């Protein structure tokens, strides 16, 4: 039903390299990564100034110790004006894409004409928690809570790691250890091929880390995870969540990662005022939810909803991004929707690229735009599940 | 500009009592408080079921150790369907009002017909943080970070507590210690008067706590009773020794609480023949230099008024959030709003300030003020750390 | 074999009140408690100056965050000279008595003529530990280790709390929940009757807590004895085994703060300064067995100490068998054939408190008072310690 | 002098001394202690471990080590559950005071076979959270580094030992350069002893389960870099300081143990004694002057032993800092030609609860290599104390 609503255009997008856990980007905070992606995205739009950006929505899940309003720090660090309206969004893994939806809605209701939306996550710098210090604990051992485990990866109702609910997904939909492993191998091979062909070069903004006291500068140019594929070692590794008979493993699951992505949205009127060249048009979107432990297949609800909102049939989509929280998540949603893997994650997915949870919703959108360009497509759809039972999805047209 | 767009109706609101820091509600988590407010608000809507709610936006600032997606936990805790779309919102103190704005917009773009929005905060249960445990620290004493200070009350760019930037406001706009104290006494008096007259009874959803002694029912806000005028005037300053003007009595406290509103489209109102409490006429966000966040409402309130097509002089009551007494004094000065139209049942200095919920808390109180004082047009404005503010214009029906 | 060795005389003893966990003395550090007991004991010796103390041995178990050499801080806090030799001793619950033995041996080898020995513990101010912050721990929940549990109350081998091994002592030697409870009640009533007759007045040095910018507080009494409630005691749940448990919080010793000290002198120094000796050390004995059997290790240390002193078990007028748990005193009375009517005549640690690093010296302080009040000459003190050990000491009241 | 029964050392042993978070950091303090006790006992032909009656073991930072570190050392070494075990803390002097108490227990007849020494795992010293029981309602809190609090900070003045080392440099007139040249000389002496196999006998190598790794050498002596050492910035007083990390002792892991027997037990079992304890001396003075407390304890030990200072063939003066060795040599008139002949802790390592026993094991090796007979070990401790011991090599 977006035909009746004002149009929203993507005029640029950019992402950081995705760094490994405690890896290439672990020295940077989440707002520094976010600032980097925002600044890089704005620098691609000819005829737009960063001072033109009126409002920011930015996803961030594990915000502990990031400081007041992560999104605000992202905006100011990227050089945006202090007049810019900033809001931090948390829909767990869907945060980065819900941020873009809210951004588009803010243009559609006429409250802004230029919006930056995206997400960022530094899982390396997620802290540990001491919960009982204010009132005290008179006697007994206490727990230092891992913020990643508690606020990012554990279902609140069942107190179950997402990995265990991924095993619930493999059981419900009949995917073996071997099927998940061979999917993971294929998505690494796609990510390495895209890397080698330079197909991430446009979307990635390399990061320059100046050296400290005499030490040499470091440039981080590529995602860290794709090169780690060892097929023999992958097929032989122990399961990560269920001993012995488990089907989910560290290699066939998304890793923990650091990264950020950002898109620049403008109204039809601003496109005309500044004579900007749009990259893409947002056609529609959809959020959906179901039983929390079945979050893995919520995209099978969000994607049809988004396609209906956009007025597009599933068969007209040229490329899908289905976020690979786990290999089995992509396999199960492909099966439920009847989407062949030859249309899914054509440059690889999060199992091979990395999964900075608050950024991945926007990261897969930047990659999708690069896939449509490289494969000469027009219609694309991104969908991402989130712990708690939800999923979000968005449909774009490349222009 | 909102008058060209689909109408958004408030059909109910509710709030928890506001508990003191480590006080009457400290045993409850932020989602338990949020669920309580949401359930209470929906119970007031004749002809609407909890299963009609399609989407939830809920503010929450200090989310550490609250678990995955605090808004989702509030929704499911309140008995909403697992189909409900849930998003947590952080705009620091403005979070609870920005959540309501986002819910209105979601109705206006046609993606929902029934939306719950608000905020919650449990400052009592904010944890401390241990950084650097992943990489290690070879040798030396290490710090445990107070999450309230870090993620709630410290300006990121200058690493200054909000109360130091309140001093900046008093210096910038010329408000003395005495003017701030007299303002604080007046707003405590208004809160106590409203308390005794029962004017909070409708908006407050009391909380029953089992005993660890017999059971306790929390029915009143905890802070208003603490006013001691003589002690307030004599206490030492809280952020600048000797010369400071900002004190703990004349600042907002740390608090626990939640508030929720139920929003519906015109079509849903007509389909179910719902009785609206209020109509959203417009809103506005604004921002300026981060250490000047205290007077960002002087930008957001005219923006919300223009968006609603309502002149400032037609507003019957304002809610200017009292992050500090000097914040209300400064914004009243800059906008030329008489205090006789401001926080008529008291403000956060006297009631409490659960940061993620206060933007929604003041809207709930505003609806009550408009009814009690027989007003029609209200405006709520709230500032937030980082330099921002949010404001909303409503019409009581 | 103390007959051919130099004689060691006790010229004074003193202890703090024993405060409950997070209770009346919780604002004081272990060296503040220890300095208080040292200073008070010296104040009792007519003709001796604090500057005459040459060496200090002080027990302390949970020494984390206490700072360098707890014993040295106790000595200096009490006003002893910076020339004073100071060593901190840890034999868990036996620390305070082993310190006295080591002080006695140092006089016997001629290396000192005046020694202060004892023990202190602030279980209140025992910290928690963060053990992997140096190397780091990349992912997962971590533990904050309770220092009382880890360094005070857990057997290192089998990783069990002392209370669980107390149950083992109940099973091994056949004592019921009710028998332990009736022992607990009796020792509480003995503690309360001594409190009421002022029989602790001489050994306790009251503590004055200066009020901040707030009234002063004087702590005069041990805090635990008044807590006896026989109906609640007999009806409380077990504290270490949910189902068949027999060991309870009321019939175990509590967590406590306190210090005690004694002043030791050689034969030649006693005469040179013309001091009235309170008692004479006749012998001592350390023993050890299986760690989880530490409860009955005093049944070895006590006969050993008696043999070392040349005195017979039936000659002893009063015994102090320390009450780590009610069942500990019951089992040691059973094995050794000692009637309860000669054991802890003013109550025991179950009712008085158990500052683990101090209790070995606290019970000797109380034993000297039991000997004076009950008209006795020979006394033996015994105390087990976690890990399987025990220490015992024989004294003659003069 | 003393008129006490004879106490003989029938053996000694030490672990290699590992660097802070280095080659031994995986091991706990009682694991290192047990390793040293077991190796020491295996060297006495005719004595079984079951003959050990009592143990005194030094350990300073005992946080998170568990009940009675000395007991864990004894049982870990395979000693009988009947063995009496006491843990001793006299800060850096703990390992030598432990040996003194062990000797005294033989002398009063309460034992005929005593094991004594010390252990320390500074790598595994934890951090403290001090106010969790009563709580802290608002505000950033602090985690205490256990090393700094219980090992290296004078309780009176809240000053690290290095700052009081600067006080030593100023009091007795020792320059940055003089402290550096002492440091290089002691590193050189330790490197030479290493290459000549002179630590092979005293060191009991540690086998770590992997590929498996074997620790055979002290880790610190290879670190000497004279250029960097003379150029590095001071570590306790910026700009003008004289004390540095290279000329100070490091943080280290390690244990050492000695086996003591009475005359009667030596005769009954026909044991060949390594040495005889002749005397000892503890002394103390102003806490911030702990650096020169050995200048009191050494004369005291010598007098107790009936030995004049000039008759000592070799001294071990523990090198808590380079300036500590300089100041005590200057005050006692001891020429550097007779001090720490195989290097000291500035080059070897300084696991504080073990160092007092460590230098005694090394002193026995120095006396044998240098054809000496009378040796004296002295070690200062934070808080103002020092301990010293005199042995005769047999
Ligand atoms: C009661 C008593 O007896 S007191 C004795 C108790 N122990 C102590 O007092 C320990 C005192 N020492 C310390 O507290 C620490 O070791 C200090 C803080 C002094 C050293 O910490 P640090 O981080 O500065 O030391 P390092 O990590 O080892 O780095 C030092 C720096 O200097 C280089 N370097 C070390 N040793 C060298 C030698 N022998 N030769 C040449 N260079 C050396 C080292 O490579 C480092 O250089 P960088 O390149 O800057 O890292
Ligand atoms: C699964 C998880 C616990 C990782 O555990 P981990 O074992 O420590 O992960 P690692 O990086 O150490 O990988 C383990 C092993 O697999 C190897 N490995 C990793 N990726 C590999 C690959 N593609 N090919 C071959 N080997 C691989 C590693 O080399 C390592 O081998 P090793 O045992 O010899 O060291 C963590 O990544 C996780 O929880 N992921 C899920 C994230 C998530 O849930 N996101 C949100 C979804 S809703
Ligand atoms: C100001 C602040 C630090 C409180 O500090 P505090 O020292 O703990 O203040 P307290 O609540 O403990 O009360 C201090 C004294 O004032 C008294 N007091 C509190 N409210 C009073 C009142 N209304 N009238 C008279 N006396 C009062 C108390 O009785 C207390 O007395 P005491 O010293 O004898 O105990 C904290 O509440 C704060 O940071 N407020 C600002 C929070 C904020 O920034 N919110 C977001 C804004 S953007
Ligand atoms: C056993 C231990 C865990 C106590 O745990 P605890 O339950 O928290 O102890 P508490 O005193 O707080 O609780 C005791 C309960 O019984 C009551 N109680 C305690 N002593 C009582 C007494 N003499 N008479 C009647 N009631 C008593 C208390 O009122 C309390 O009642 P409540 O349920 O209403 O709160 C702890 O004290 C311990 O480990 N002791 C062993 C000491 C030790 O190991 N020493 C060295 C070994 S060698
Ligand atoms: Cl959800
Ligand atoms: Cl802002
Ligand atoms: Cl033992
Ligand atoms: Cl000392
Ligand atoms: N790029
Ligand atoms: N992976
Ligand atoms: N209803
Ligand atoms: N109500
Ligand atoms: N207040
Ligand atoms: N007394
Ligand atoms: N008790
Ligand atoms: N042997
Ligand atoms: N050896
Ligand atoms: N060194």
PDB file of N, CA, C and O in Angstrom, chain C residues 23-29 32-33 36 206-212 214-220:
ATOM      1  N   UNK C  23      27.945  -6.828  61.334  1.00  0.00           N
ATOM      2  CA  UNK C  23      27.297  -6.368  62.546  1.00  0.00           C
ATOM      3  C   UNK C  23      28.021  -5.243  63.254  1.00  0.00           C
ATOM      4  O   UNK C  23      28.458  -4.281  62.616  1.00  0.00           O
ATOM      5  N   UNK C  24      28.173  -5.374  64.577  1.00  0.00           N
ATOM      6  CA  UNK C  24      28.585  -4.257  65.423  1.00  0.00           C
ATOM      7  C   UNK C  24      30.019  -3.797  65.175  1.00  0.00           C
ATOM      8  O   UNK C  24      30.356  -2.663  65.521  1.00  0.00           O
ATOM      9  N   UNK C  25      30.874  -4.639  64.603  1.00  0.00           N
ATOM     10  CA  UNK C  25      32.278  -4.286  64.418  1.00  0.00           C
ATOM     11  C   UNK C  25      32.660  -4.256  62.947  1.00  0.00           C
ATOM     12  O   UNK C  25      33.851  -4.176  62.627  1.00  0.00           O
ATOM     13  N   UNK C  26      31.669  -4.283  62.053  1.00  0.00           N
ATOM     14  CA  UNK C  26      31.922  -4.447  60.631  1.00  0.00           C
ATOM     15  C   UNK C  26      32.598  -3.235  60.009  1.00  0.00           C
ATOM     16  O   UNK C  26      33.145  -3.360  58.916  1.00  0.00           O
ATOM     17  N   UNK C  27      32.579  -2.079  60.673  1.00  0.00           N
ATOM     18  CA  UNK C  27      33.285  -0.913  60.154  1.00  0.00           C
ATOM     19  C   UNK C  27      34.784  -0.942  60.434  1.00  0.00           C
ATOM     20  O   UNK C  27      35.505  -0.092  59.906  1.00  0.00           O
ATOM     21  N   UNK C  28      35.277  -1.879  61.243  1.00  0.00           N
ATOM     22  CA  UNK C  28      36.695  -1.959  61.563  1.00  0.00           C
ATOM     23  C   UNK C  28      37.367  -3.018  60.699  1.00  0.00           C
ATOM     24  O   UNK C  28      36.790  -4.078  60.436  1.00  0.00           O
ATOM     25  N   UNK C  29      38.583  -2.713  60.248  1.00  0.00           N
ATOM     26  CA  UNK C  29      39.426  -3.671  59.556  1.00  0.00           C
ATOM     27  C   UNK C  29      40.037  -4.659  60.551  1.00  0.00           C
ATOM     28  O   UNK C  29      40.115  -4.396  61.755  1.00  0.00           O
ATOM     29  N   UNK C  32      42.726  -3.130  62.679  1.00  0.00           N
ATOM     30  CA  UNK C  32      42.162  -2.274  63.719  1.00  0.00           C
ATOM     31  C   UNK C  32      41.671  -3.106  64.901  1.00  0.00           C
ATOM     32  O   UNK C  32      41.869  -2.725  66.060  1.00  0.00           O
ATOM     33  N   UNK C  33      41.055  -4.259  64.630  1.00  0.00           N
ATOM     34  CA  UNK C  33      40.648  -5.140  65.719  1.00  0.00           C
ATOM     35  C   UNK C  33      41.864  -5.698  66.445  1.00  0.00           C
ATOM     36  O   UNK C  33      41.888  -5.763  67.685  1.00  0.00           O
ATOM     37  N   UNK C  36      43.611  -3.294  68.692  1.00  0.00           N
ATOM     38  CA  UNK C  36      42.835  -3.039  69.901  1.00  0.00           C
ATOM     39  C   UNK C  36      43.090  -4.101  70.959  1.00  0.00           C
ATOM     40  O   UNK C  36      43.235  -3.779  72.141  1.00  0.00           O
ATOM     41  N   UNK C 206      36.193  -3.177  75.691  1.00  0.00           N
ATOM     42  CA  UNK C 206      35.160  -2.571  74.841  1.00  0.00           C
ATOM     43  C   UNK C 206      35.753  -1.663  73.774  1.00  0.00           C
ATOM     44  O   UNK C 206      36.853  -1.120  73.906  1.00  0.00           O
ATOM     45  N   UNK C 207      34.999  -1.497  72.693  1.00  0.00           N
ATOM     46  CA  UNK C 207      35.456  -0.738  71.545  1.00  0.00           C
ATOM     47  C   UNK C 207      34.561   0.479  71.385  1.00  0.00           C
ATOM     48  O   UNK C 207      33.335   0.377  71.497  1.00  0.00           O
ATOM     49  N   UNK C 208      35.180   1.628  71.144  1.00  0.00           N
ATOM     50  CA  UNK C 208      34.470   2.880  70.942  1.00  0.00           C
ATOM     51  C   UNK C 208      34.564   3.274  69.476  1.00  0.00           C
ATOM     52  O   UNK C 208      35.665   3.483  68.955  1.00  0.00           O
ATOM     53  N   UNK C 209      33.410   3.373  68.816  1.00  0.00           N
ATOM     54  CA  UNK C 209      33.355   3.829  67.433  1.00  0.00           C
ATOM     55  C   UNK C 209      33.101   5.329  67.414  1.00  0.00           C
ATOM     56  O   UNK C 209      31.976   5.761  67.720  1.00  0.00           O
ATOM     57  N   UNK C 210      34.089   6.150  67.065  1.00  0.00           N
ATOM     58  CA  UNK C 210      33.862   7.598  67.009  1.00  0.00           C
ATOM     59  C   UNK C 210      32.777   7.947  66.001  1.00  0.00           C
ATOM     60  O   UNK C 210      32.720   7.396  64.900  1.00  0.00           O
ATOM     61  N   UNK C 211      31.898   8.860  66.398  1.00  0.00           N
ATOM     62  CA  UNK C 211      30.856   9.314  65.502  1.00  0.00           C
ATOM     63  C   UNK C 211      31.411  10.295  64.481  1.00  0.00           C
ATOM     64  O   UNK C 211      32.253  11.140  64.790  1.00  0.00           O
ATOM     65  N   UNK C 212      30.929  10.166  63.246  1.00  0.00           N
ATOM     66  CA  UNK C 212      31.274  11.114  62.200  1.00  0.00           C
ATOM     67  C   UNK C 212      30.698  12.494  62.535  1.00  0.00           C
ATOM     68  O   UNK C 212      30.110  12.718  63.600  1.00  0.00           O
ATOM     69  N   UNK C 214      26.801  12.716  64.407  1.00  0.00           N
ATOM     70  CA  UNK C 214      26.539  11.322  64.755  1.00  0.00           C
ATOM     71  C   UNK C 214      27.181  10.928  66.095  1.00  0.00           C
ATOM     72  O   UNK C 214      28.379  11.153  66.321  1.00  0.00           O
ATOM     73  N   UNK C 215      26.380  10.339  66.979  1.00  0.00           N
ATOM     74  CA  UNK C 215      26.878   9.980  68.314  1.00  0.00           C
ATOM     75  C   UNK C 215      27.882   8.836  68.288  1.00  0.00           C
ATOM     76  O   UNK C 215      27.864   7.970  67.410  1.00  0.00           O
ATOM     77  N   UNK C 216      28.768   8.848  69.281  1.00  0.00           N
ATOM     78  CA  UNK C 216      29.699   7.747  69.490  1.00  0.00           C
ATOM     79  C   UNK C 216      28.946   6.480  69.878  1.00  0.00           C
ATOM     80  O   UNK C 216      27.873   6.528  70.478  1.00  0.00           O
ATOM     81  N   UNK C 217      29.534   5.334  69.553  1.00  0.00           N
ATOM     82  CA  UNK C 217      28.971   4.033  69.895  1.00  0.00           C
ATOM     83  C   UNK C 217      30.040   3.223  70.620  1.00  0.00           C
ATOM     84  O   UNK C 217      31.172   3.115  70.140  1.00  0.00           O
ATOM     85  N   UNK C 218      29.689   2.652  71.766  1.00  0.00           N
ATOM     86  CA  UNK C 218      30.572   1.717  72.451  1.00  0.00           C
ATOM     87  C   UNK C 218      30.014   0.311  72.310  1.00  0.00           C
ATOM     88  O   UNK C 218      28.838   0.072  72.607  1.00  0.00           O
ATOM     89  N   UNK C 219      30.852  -0.607  71.847  1.00  0.00           N
ATOM     90  CA  UNK C 219      30.506  -2.018  71.753  1.00  0.00           C
ATOM     91  C   UNK C 219      31.158  -2.720  72.935  1.00  0.00           C
ATOM     92  O   UNK C 219      32.390  -2.747  73.047  1.00  0.00           O
ATOM     93  N   UNK C 220      30.336  -3.271  73.833  1.00  0.00           N
ATOM     94  CA  UNK C 220      30.810  -3.886  75.066  1.00  0.00           C
ATOM     95  C   UNK C 220      30.637  -5.398  75.106  1.00  0.00           C
ATOM     96  O   UNK C 220      31.475  -6.088  75.690  1.00  0.00           O
TER      97      UNK C 220
END
